[PDB]
Amino acid sequence: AQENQVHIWAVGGCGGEIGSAFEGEVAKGLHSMTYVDTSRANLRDSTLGDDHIYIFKDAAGRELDGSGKKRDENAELICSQIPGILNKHTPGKFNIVVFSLSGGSGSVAGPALVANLLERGERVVCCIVASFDDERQTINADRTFKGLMAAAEGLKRPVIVSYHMNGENGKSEQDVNLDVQVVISQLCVLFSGENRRLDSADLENFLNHPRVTGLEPTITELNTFMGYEWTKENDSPIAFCTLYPKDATKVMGVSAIYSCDGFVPESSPIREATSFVLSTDRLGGIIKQIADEAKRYIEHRNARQQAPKVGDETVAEAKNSGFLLF
Amino acid sequence: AQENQVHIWAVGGCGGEIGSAFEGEVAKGLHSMTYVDTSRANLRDSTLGDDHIYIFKDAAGRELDGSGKKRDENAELICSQIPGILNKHTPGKFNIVVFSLSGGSGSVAGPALVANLLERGERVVCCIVASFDDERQTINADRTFKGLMAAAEGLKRPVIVSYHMNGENGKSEQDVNLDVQVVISQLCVLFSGENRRLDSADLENFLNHPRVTGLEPTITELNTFMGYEWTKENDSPIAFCTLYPKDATKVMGVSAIYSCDGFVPESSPIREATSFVLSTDRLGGIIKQIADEAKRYIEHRNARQQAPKVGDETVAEAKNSGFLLF
Amino acid sequence: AQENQVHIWAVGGCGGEIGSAFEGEVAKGLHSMTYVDTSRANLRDSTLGDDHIYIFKDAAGRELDGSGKKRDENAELICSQIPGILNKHTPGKFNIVVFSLSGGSGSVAGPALVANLLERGERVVCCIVASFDDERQTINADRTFKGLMAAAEGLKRPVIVSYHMNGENGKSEQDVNLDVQVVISQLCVLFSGENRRLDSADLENFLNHPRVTGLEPTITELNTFMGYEWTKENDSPIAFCTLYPKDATKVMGVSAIYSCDGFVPESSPIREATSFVLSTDRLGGIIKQIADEAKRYIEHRNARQQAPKVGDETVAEAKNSGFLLF
Amino acid sequence: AQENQVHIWAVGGCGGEIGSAFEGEVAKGLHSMTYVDTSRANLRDSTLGDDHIYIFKDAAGRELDGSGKKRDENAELICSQIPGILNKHTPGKFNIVVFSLSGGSGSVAGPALVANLLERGERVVCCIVASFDDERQTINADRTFKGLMAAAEGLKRPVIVSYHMNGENGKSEQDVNLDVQVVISQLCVLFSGENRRLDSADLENFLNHPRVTGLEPTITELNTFMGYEWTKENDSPIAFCTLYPKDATKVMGVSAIYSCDGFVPESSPIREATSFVLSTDRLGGIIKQIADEAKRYIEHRNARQQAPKVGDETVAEAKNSGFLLF
Numbered sequence A, B, C, D: 001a002q003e004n005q006v007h008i009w010a011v012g013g014c015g016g017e018i019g020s021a022f023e024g025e026v027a028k029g030l031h032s033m034t035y036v037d038t039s040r041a042n043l044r045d046s047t048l049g050d051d052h053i054y055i056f057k058d059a060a061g062r063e064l065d066g067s068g069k070k071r072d073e074n075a076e077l078i079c080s081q082i083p084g085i086l087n088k089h090t091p092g093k094f095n096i097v098v099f100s101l102s103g104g105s106g107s108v109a110g111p112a113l114v115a116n117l118l119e120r121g122e123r124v125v126c127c128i129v130a131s132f133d134d135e136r137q138t139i140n141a142d143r144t145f146k147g148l149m150a151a152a153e154g155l156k157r158p159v160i161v162s163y164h165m166n167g168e169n170g171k172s173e174q175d176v177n178l179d180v181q182v183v184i185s186q187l188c189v190l191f192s193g194e195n196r197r198l199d200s201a202d203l204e205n206f207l208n209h210p211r212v213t214g215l216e217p218t219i220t221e222l223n224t225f226m227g228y229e230w231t232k233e234n235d236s237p238i239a240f241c242t243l244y245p246k247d248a249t250k251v252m253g254v255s256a257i258y259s260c261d262g263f264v265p266e267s268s269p270i271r272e273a274t275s276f277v278l279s280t281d282r283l284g285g286i287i288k289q290i291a292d293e294a295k296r297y298i299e300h301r302n303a304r305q306q307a308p309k310v311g312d313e314t315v316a317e318a319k320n321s322g323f324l325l326f
């Protein structure tokens, strides 16, 4: 009941909340959207029907009610039901998987969706939000990110990631949601297929850059810019695709291995040149920042005072039901 | 005849008096409530029917009339009838067992209920009141608390306790009742399941923290705060779940192993951010204070003057019925 | 004295009562029927003669009078006499074993008949009624159902089961009887062999699906629908066979591994497309529901008050005949 | 000279008087009846012939003339002559031993008959009347009840008892007789074997419940109810068998380990659902009441004034024949 050119996979509660602003676009036929979550708590007022909502179910066929930031809890159930999701909801030509590395549901169904879509040969770009409010969230972000890195090397296909941070620059979760929504909205225009000079084969090589560049397949970061001022700082990316409005000057000074051009129709809401840039030079910084939080919480964990423990003989004395010793 | 989302187990006379303020909520469907006691002395004017009241019975099937602050008197009867209580009164999804460590009934049926609910896999939080007015009460409080500590280690599942004191800061029993009623009222909102971003699995891991944190299972203290000023003193809790009103700023500076977020509906009576904090750093202080009272009463007991005993030969002389010396 | 195209094995009291509505069909040559039971109490007014009734006999050659919901009582006798039943009453080309999982007779002679018929290479479909009124009935249903699951894996041949529930939707036993009678009546038309486009080899592969599908042999659930509305909910079965009336549209949207078609003669009482769907996706739900009742009765059993026991010395004192102590 | 489906053993004077209302039923072939007593005082006008009356005889082969509430007087003779009673009067398929725990004859021949019938493998249900008018009656009732409990525990077979009280609710002996007669009539209807869905094995497992339930064999109390209102108070029985009239709704809300169903013929005098319920939760109350009566009578006995005893020297003086002092 929707156009399947671009498919948005709002995985997890964080992905569902971020994608809740794209429900109107589905009605207008811009793109198809599918919610994937282990709980229906966030989705109590979605405009889309249950035909666009999938909730993971246990062995008894009953819907789960969240993972509670515990990735290992429902890993088997989620990984087993991922193929079923793709059959019921056919992936679009270009897929946008949105999830959070910190939760226990989005960070398991997210990489599982990306791995299956990449293995099937689909074109998928992941929008990622990472939080470090707790030790559990930080460890989940560390393990999920390493999982994606292992996915790119294991599948020999790059995993394009639009990374985001909850605590960056003191931005609230509302601010981060606006940032991600801008990236998804721009990716919708890029993947719409209505661009004059941009073909499907061009975007296939853009997303699967090692086909053309010959570089080693690894996780790649996607950055989106407007105007031409971004060329000074990122003059040497792996690849980039730029969409220009009518009678717009090209971008110069960028020496990329691969490049693409597109011309946005006058009706579409793009008024200045928009560039989608792939690079892996900032991956080391992102990994270091994640490891910094992990080290910080490990040091803080080692500062925990040991809890007062009752004697082991007392426990043996409390073998009576109710653990009463009198 | 009541909603079973949250179940309040008013165990003992102290628990019954504290819970008597929640009878109106039962009629309004907020939560289900069950009185558990060895006597009907306090429950002579309860609005709830006898279907919500369970009184322990002896071997002959006749209701008891209290334990008289003697824990060992009816321990076998209470522990044997605990499973029957849970069948007749089905435990709610979240259970709140309220009892006093000093009495002989609440301090036995309380830990028995908690041990059975934890063993069955239910989610239970205990509200506890401790008194040290008499040596018997002090020894009972010391004994019951050690029993709970052995219960947490024996069941490998934490026993969350909202600890309270009768003699703290010169507060009367009425003042302590208001303090506990606030905690139970807030726990009712937390466990209501109507929070937007809070799932049952989030609360399951919050209550059973060693699943997520990996810490050793032990008795854990629960503290509840409003606003954000509490972050300065308790910046290092094991876990904490915060419920925010509409457009409320998050809590910063708290580095917990696990945390949860929730958003209170506008209709519910929460107007400022309420935090439910779990920590075990004050357990040593509580145990020390309890042991201080026990030492004080042991010293006072050793100062008792020996009662003037009649001669043993006189006892042999008074073997006549009625013990008459003539 | 009857046509042997379809054979109905009314096993047990529940099976005999359900099948008592098919006695008229036997006289009209629609199918052959055989009552198998450990007691003749229910069969005091059957139109069919004793040549169509088999009652289990003990070692002395005398007919039993029921099992009393005790499966283990006559398991040896029943399993020993099953081959004798099949010789005296030759199984039809398609067999319909009807029995209840709760009783002690139908739940032993039922699976015994199914295991023998499957081992001999016959084509058998079981109609099953499960009850959970008592702990004994629930445990019998749990053990019988697991027995059938072990039968399918041990024989490497699926055990097709038309599952039914006594307490489902508050339906009375009369309502469940009507539901089963409809399924048996439809299976009679399917197995009649008078369908234009349906062959015996097609039905052989339909019942023994792993021959064609290659799936693992296990217990399979049979569901029957009229019309085409069922396709929305069960669009992904293992296999399904549909019987269409004259000039009836085919079923679309169902992606099954195996499928069959048949055209009902105009005289036969089928007026809309009837589908026979095999699936194992609801087996987990059925097993969970059975285990839920078993857990409930185990908890209820642990709440039993221990019976008052006279002293062991008193028993030793009552060694005198008549157990009188004076 | 009578139908042997149900056998009524009217033991003792109390049993004979209660059973005197069933002679017409014996004349109509409903059931066989046998009077067993140590005296013929009550049986001076019985319609039944002496072939249905057995009177205990002493060593010299002459009939006794009662025990006079002294159990130990003729215990050996009764225990020795019990097998002869069973040989001369063949026990029915279901036996109903009716006796009083207070007398010296019924309370000895009753338990002996029950123990012999249980040992032989027969199915026996005891109707019991207990009186506490005298200390001797109270002690006899206590001793007989303890003996029955010992028999149930030592035979590993439950002793089903329909307990009755003479002094309960101020009911006269006529009222207790009517109650016991109603219970016996209902048991006769249950045991008639003419019920549609009820087998002999069903009743065998119902009476010998540890075969099915697995519970410890002990004395079990039988209670009979009409309608469905009894479910509220006795929702947790060990077992229960219900007889329904034509088109009668089943009983719901009763969670028993074992249960049976039967359908009364339209001719039989049952117009509403009749339930026979087995439970051991009220045994403690009965034992407590009996012990309370025994304690009361012991206290009253200890208050007896010592009889004025003549001097022992006077007794030595009165060694003359006739004990004359002169």
Ligand SMILES: Nc1nc2c(ncn2[C@@H]2O[C@H](COP(=O)(O)CP(=O)(O)OP(=O)(O)O)[C@@H](O)[C@H]2O)c(=O)[nH]1
Residues within 6 Å of the ligand: A012, A013, A014, A015, A017, A018, A037, A038, A039, A065, A066, A067, A068, A069, A100, A102, A103, A104, A105, A106, A107, A129, A131, A132, A133, A137, A166, A172, A173, A174, A176, A177, B197, B199, B201, B202, B261
């Ligand atoms: N920037 C955002 N961060 C969010 C949002 N929702 C949650 N989060 C953050 O993500 C983390 C929790 O991730 P999720 O809410 O997706 C948890 P998940 O869906 O995986 O499990 P359940 O909560 O059991 O559904 C935590 O740090 C939250 O503060 C959101 O809309 N925006």
Ligand SMILES: Nc1nc2c(ncn2[C@@H]2O[C@H](COP(=O)(O)CP(=O)(O)OP(=O)(O)O)[C@@H](O)[C@H]2O)c(=O)[nH]1
Residues within 6 Å of the ligand: B012, B013, B014, B015, B017, B018, B037, B038, B039, B065, B066, B067, B068, B069, B100, B102, B103, B104, B105, B106, B107, B129, B131, B132, B133, B137, B166, B172, B173, B174, B176, B177
């Ligand atoms: N803060 C409160 N303390 C209470 C309250 N009621 C009793 N207590 C205190 O608890 C202690 C006695 O415990 P309980 O009254 O619960 C006695 P228990 O129920 O175990 O036995 P019974 O009195 O025979 O029912 C003693 O120190 C009391 O002062 C109350 O409503 N609030």
Ligand SMILES: Nc1nc2c(ncn2[C@@H]2O[C@H](COP(=O)(O)CP(=O)(O)OP(=O)(O)O)[C@@H](O)[C@H]2O)c(=O)[nH]1
Residues within 6 Å of the ligand: C012, C013, C014, C015, C017, C018, C037, C038, C039, C065, C066, C067, C068, C069, C100, C102, C103, C104, C105, C106, C107, C129, C131, C132, C133, C137, C166, C172, C173, C174, C176, C177, D197, D199, D201, D202, D261
């Ligand atoms: N839906 C139905 N359930 C039935 C019917 N007859 C019995 N039952 C249920 O099945 C259960 C008892 O099973 P059966 O009567 O078949 C006992 P079985 O034949 O195995 O042993 P006997 O009674 O000794 O012959 C119990 O729950 C009954 O309520 C029936 O006609 N329909």
Ligand SMILES: Nc1nc2c(ncn2[C@@H]2O[C@H](COP(=O)(O)CP(=O)(O)OP(=O)(O)O)[C@@H](O)[C@H]2O)c(=O)[nH]1
Residues within 6 Å of the ligand: D012, D013, D014, D015, D017, D018, D037, D038, D039, D065, D066, D067, D068, D069, D100, D102, D103, D104, D105, D106, D107, D129, D131, D132, D133, D137, D166, D172, D173, D174, D176, D177
């Ligand atoms: N409810 C009834 N109680 C009875 C009846 N007959 C006697 N009793 C009571 O039972 C007690 C005496 O028991 P029995 O009459 O059976 C004396 P038993 O037969 O053992 O000796 P004999 O009197 O020498 O035959 C005493 O309390 C009587 O009041 C009766 O018909 N109904």
